[PDB]
Amino acid sequence: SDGNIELTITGMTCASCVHNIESKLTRTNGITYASVALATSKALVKFDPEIIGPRDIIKIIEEIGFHASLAQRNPNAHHLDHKMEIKQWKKSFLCSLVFGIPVMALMIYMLIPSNEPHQSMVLDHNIIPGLSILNLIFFILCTFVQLLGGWYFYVQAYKSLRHRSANMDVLIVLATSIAYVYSLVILVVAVAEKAERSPVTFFDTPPMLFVFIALGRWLEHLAKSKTSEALAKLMSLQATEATVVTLGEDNLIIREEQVPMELVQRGDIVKVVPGGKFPVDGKVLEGNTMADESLITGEAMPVTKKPGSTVIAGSINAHGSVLIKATHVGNDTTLAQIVKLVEEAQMSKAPIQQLADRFSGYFVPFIIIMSTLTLVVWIVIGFIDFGVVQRYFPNPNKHISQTEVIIRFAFQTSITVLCIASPSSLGLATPTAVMVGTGVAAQNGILIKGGKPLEMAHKIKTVMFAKTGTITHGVPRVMRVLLLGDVATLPLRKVLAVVGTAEASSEHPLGVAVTKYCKEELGTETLGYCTDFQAVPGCGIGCKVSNVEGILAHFSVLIGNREWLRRNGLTISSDVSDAMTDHEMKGQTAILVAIDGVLCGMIAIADAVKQEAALAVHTLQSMGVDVVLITGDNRKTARAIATQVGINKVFAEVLPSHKVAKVQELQNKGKKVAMVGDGVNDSPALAQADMGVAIGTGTDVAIEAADVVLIRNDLLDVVASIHLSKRTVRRIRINLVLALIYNLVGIPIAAGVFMPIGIVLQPWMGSAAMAASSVSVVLSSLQLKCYKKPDLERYEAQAHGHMKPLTASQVSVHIG
Numbered sequence: 001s002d003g004n005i006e007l008t009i010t011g012m013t014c015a016s017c018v019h020n021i022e023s024k025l026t027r028t029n030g031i032t033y034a035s036v037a038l039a040t041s042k043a044l045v046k047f048d049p050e051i052i053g054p055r056d057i058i059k060i061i062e063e064i065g066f067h068a069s070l071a072q073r074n075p076n077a078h079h080l081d082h083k084m085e086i087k088q089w090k091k092s093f094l095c096s097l098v099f100g101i102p103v104m105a106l107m108i109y110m111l112i113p114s115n116e117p118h119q120s121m122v123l124d125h126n127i128i129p130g131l132s133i134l135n136l137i138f139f140i141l142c143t144f145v146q147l148l149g150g151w152y153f154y155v156q157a158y159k160s161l162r163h164r165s166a167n168m169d170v171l172i173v174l175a176t177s178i179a180y181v182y183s184l185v186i187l188v189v190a191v192a193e194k195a196e197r198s199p200v201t202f203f204d205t206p207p208m209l210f211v212f213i214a215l216g217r218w219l220e221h222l223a224k225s226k227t228s229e230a231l232a233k234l235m236s237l238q239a240t241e242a243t244v245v246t247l248g249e250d251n252l253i254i255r256e257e258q259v260p261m262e263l264v265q266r267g268d269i270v271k272v273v274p275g276g277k278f279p280v281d282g283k284v285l286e287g288n289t290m291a292d293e294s295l296i297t298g299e300a301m302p303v304t305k306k307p308g309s310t311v312i313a314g315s316i317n318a319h320g321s322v323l324i325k326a327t328h329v330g331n332d333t334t335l336a337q338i339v340k341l342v343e344e345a346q347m348s349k350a351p352i353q354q355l356a357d358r359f360s361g362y363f364v365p366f367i368i369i370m371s372t373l374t375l376v377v378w379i380v381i382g383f384i385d386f387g388v389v390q391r392y393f394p395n396p397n398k399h400i401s402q403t404e405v406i407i408r409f410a411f412q413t414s415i416t417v418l419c420i421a422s423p424s425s426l427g428l429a430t431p432t433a434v435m436v437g438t439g440v441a442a443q444n445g446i447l448i449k450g451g452k453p454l455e456m457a458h459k460i461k462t463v464m465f466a467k468t469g470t471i472t473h474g475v476p477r478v479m480r481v482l483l484l485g486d487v488a489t490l491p492l493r494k495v496l497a498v499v500g501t502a503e504a505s506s507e508h509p510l511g512v513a514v515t516k517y518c519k520e521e522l523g524t525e526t527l528g529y530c531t532d533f534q535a536v537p538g539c540g541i542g543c544k545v546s547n548v549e550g551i552l553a554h555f556s557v558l559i560g561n562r563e564w565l566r567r568n569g570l571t572i573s574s575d576v577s578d579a580m581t582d583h584e585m586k587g588q589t590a591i592l593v594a595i596d597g598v599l600c601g602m603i604a605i606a607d608a609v610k611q612e613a614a615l616a617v618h619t620l621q622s623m624g625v626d627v628v629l630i631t632g633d634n635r636k637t638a639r640a641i642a643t644q645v646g647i648n649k650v651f652a653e654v655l656p657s658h659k660v661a662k663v664q665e666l667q668n669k670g671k672k673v674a675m676v677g678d679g680v681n682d683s684p685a686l687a688q689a690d691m692g693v694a695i696g697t698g699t700d701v702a703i704e705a706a707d708v709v710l711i712r713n714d715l716l717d718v719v720a721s722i723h724l725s726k727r728t729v730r731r732i733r734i735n736l737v738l739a740l741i742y743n744l745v746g747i748p749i750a751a752g753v754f755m756p757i758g759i760v761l762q763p764w765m766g767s768a769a770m771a772a773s774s775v776s777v778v779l780s781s782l783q784l785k786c787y788k789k790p791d792l793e794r795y796e797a798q799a800h801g802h803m804k805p806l807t808a809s810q811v812s813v814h815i816g
């Protein structure tokens with residue numbers, strides 16, 4: 001309700017660029033939140049609508065120097081495929097190689113002298129005093145490769161400098177330009193005084209630098225493209241066309257037309273042939289078949305589909321042809337919001353994420369400053385204290401004096417110090433790891449929306465389990481009926497009929513369960529009238545039913561918890577109070593019966609706990625996370641059900657009205673808490689809950705409060721989600737550690753600090769190391785793809801042998 005927009009940005013190539021984007025867009029008034037993702041080439045901003053419109057924000061973006069636009073809905077193919085830039089990097093790298101090959105050849109020639117040289121290594125035979133032929137060929141290669149290849153980098157530095165920010169390639173432009181100019185001036189002085197010996201100059205480095213930098217950019221963009229495999233597949237999995245037909249009377253054949261997605265609308269009939277795709281989600285009309293959700297929910301067993309079931313737009317048909325009534329078309333499709341969630345996931349930046357953005361923003365300036373300081377220190381120490389340098393540079397060469405070799409060494413060190421920095425590595429260390437973690441999670445059915453839960457799941461120390469829909473399957477079934485009051489005027493069939501018709505309006509899962517049970521065990525699907533209906537959350541229901549004779553041919557009812565009776569002046573006798581205690585002791589919820597103030601009997605309505613709950617909870621508490629069950633049912637029922645799962649503390653008689661006070665009660669101590677809710681049923685609790693994962697929200701991942709979604713109703717998804725977040729955040733930390741230690745070792749090592757020992761790297765080695773690090777970080781992130789979703793037996797394999805027992809006595813409940 002604040003006009004937030006998802007914006008598409010082009011030209012993003014450096015992390016410092018996006019840092020500039022956030023910095024200034026926050027600098028501009030009227031913007032409260034501004035985040036940009038470099039990897040996905042997109043930007044999302046929340047802005048005040050009336051004062052400023054999207055035109056103004058976009059225009060701010062172009063005056064930055066980048067081309068933006070409102071993100072489209074379907075078309076997002078060429079933005080994420082990365083094909084174009086990897087192809088032009090192929091082009092540039094090959095254009096650099098066709099000149100590096102001569103550099104390779106001359107380097108190998110000049111390094112190793114032959115055993116029996118033909119003419120005593122005449123390759124360096126000078127022609128013009130001070131200008132060796134080798135130096136001249138170096139000059140021509142360097143000049144031509146500069147002019148042609150470095151055009152791209154020069155233009156990038158030019159456009160970057162047109163504004164305040166300096167991107168990554170600018171420092172490479174400085175490296176090459178400084179090498180060029182200093183080599184040129186040394187050559188000019190050599191040819192001016194007509195020096196006998198041509199000097200050694202940095203014409204070797206520009207083409208080697210270009211070859212290795214192009215190779216590194218190619219490799220790292222290829223790896224980045226491999227990062228988006230999951231999102232790319234999900235995006236290019238939706239069918240762009242569908243078979244729409246017309247039905248005469250009995251779903252017969254009238255006519256068929258082939259239609260694209262933009263034209264089809266809701267309610268249309270779509271035919272999918274065997275082996276076909278599902279282009280639109282909808283309701284199954286007729287035709288038994290099977291479907292597979294491997295690419296969507298990451299499940300294994302091919303899900304069966306029958307007339308009246310649901311479908312997913314993207315599953316492959318297996319048997320026969322089936323007709324579907326369109327219910328969600330285009331953006332409505334489940335895959336649409338799945339991919340939307342995945343792509344926005346890399347928009348909610350983590351604390352470490354924004355720290356990395358900050359550092360990378362002020363990194364290239366830091367690198368250039370450090371390079372200049374290194375140059376200054378080397379030149380001054382040479383010009384003043386020559387004893388230290390001569391301690392390891394004693395070679396007396398009348399051809400080249402110490403005053404010149406020292407300056408040359410200083411320039412080499414300053415070139416290699418900024419040629420070894422990898423701003424790209426630091427910038428893309430975290431975002432790519434986040435992208436790969438989210439992709440693997442989605443491939444397993446886990447939709448970890450937002451990047452915040454990735455790290456915020458690291459610090460979780462308590463998990464709040466809901467009872468209905470999470471611990472239980474959510475399909476309660478009626479066990480047995482108890483009769484307490486009169487029988488003559490209250491025959492069993494009549495009382496069940498009247499109660500069922502009364503609670504027909506109810507939408508509580510147990511209410512619908514009892515409706516179906518009564519209808520099936522009476523055979524009378526019809527029901528009477530209802531008047532004066534109310535539903536107090538967490539207490540019960542009650543209403544007035546008329547037309548009782550409708551089913552009797554074959555009445556103010558009160559149904560709810562004990563609090564409803566005591567509040568309504570309905571005494572609960574000890575005999576009945578103890579009557580249901582037997583049920584509650586077996587972890588099965590029970591509901592009493594009261595009509596016109598007469599407690600006729602009681603009804604036992606319960607659902608078996610998920611068999612996997614015990615293993616999942618034992619693993620979760622062994623992993624080092626507290627577990628607590630939240631429920632609104634009777635305290636005895638919570639006590640019994642916790643036994644089947646072994647929960648130390650629970651919160652029973654927690655009516656949905658508050659349903660959150662206990663969240664704060666657990667939060668106030670500061671320990672992080674996560675809840676595993678249902679979604680729409682208790683969305684506010686998840687919203688307040690720090691890490692609220694929705695369980696079983698298949699085909700309805702459109703949940704706002706929950707920051708994590710499990711497309712499949714499998715409790716083990718929760719433990720898998722926490723464990724996957726653990727490893728993904730560990731990988732983010734590892735990537736940051738690598739991208740840092742690389743820089744803090746390269747800058748000294750490239751600064752020649754350890755040269756006295758005898759380890760000094762000549763310039764192009766710096767570019768090689770830059771490429772190596774910038775690709776190694778991405779490979780480390782890609783390693784996350786090698787994740788195997790642990791299966792049932794796997795968890796108890798490590799948990800087997802220690803299922804710590806506990807009786808109801810050693811179990812806690814809510815206080816007050």
Ligand SMILES: Nc1ncnc2c1ncn2[C@@H]1O[C@H](COP(=O)(O)OP(=O)(O)NP(=O)(O)O)[C@@H](O)[C@H]1O
Binds near residue numbers: 539561
């Ligand atoms: N349809 C109903 N008829 C009679 N009583 C009901 C009905 N629905 C709820 N109640 C009463 O209100 C209480 C609320 O139950 P409920 O809050 O759904 O427990 P839960 O297992 O924690 N499910 P949830 O609210 O999703 O966490 C029930 O225990 C009953 O005592």
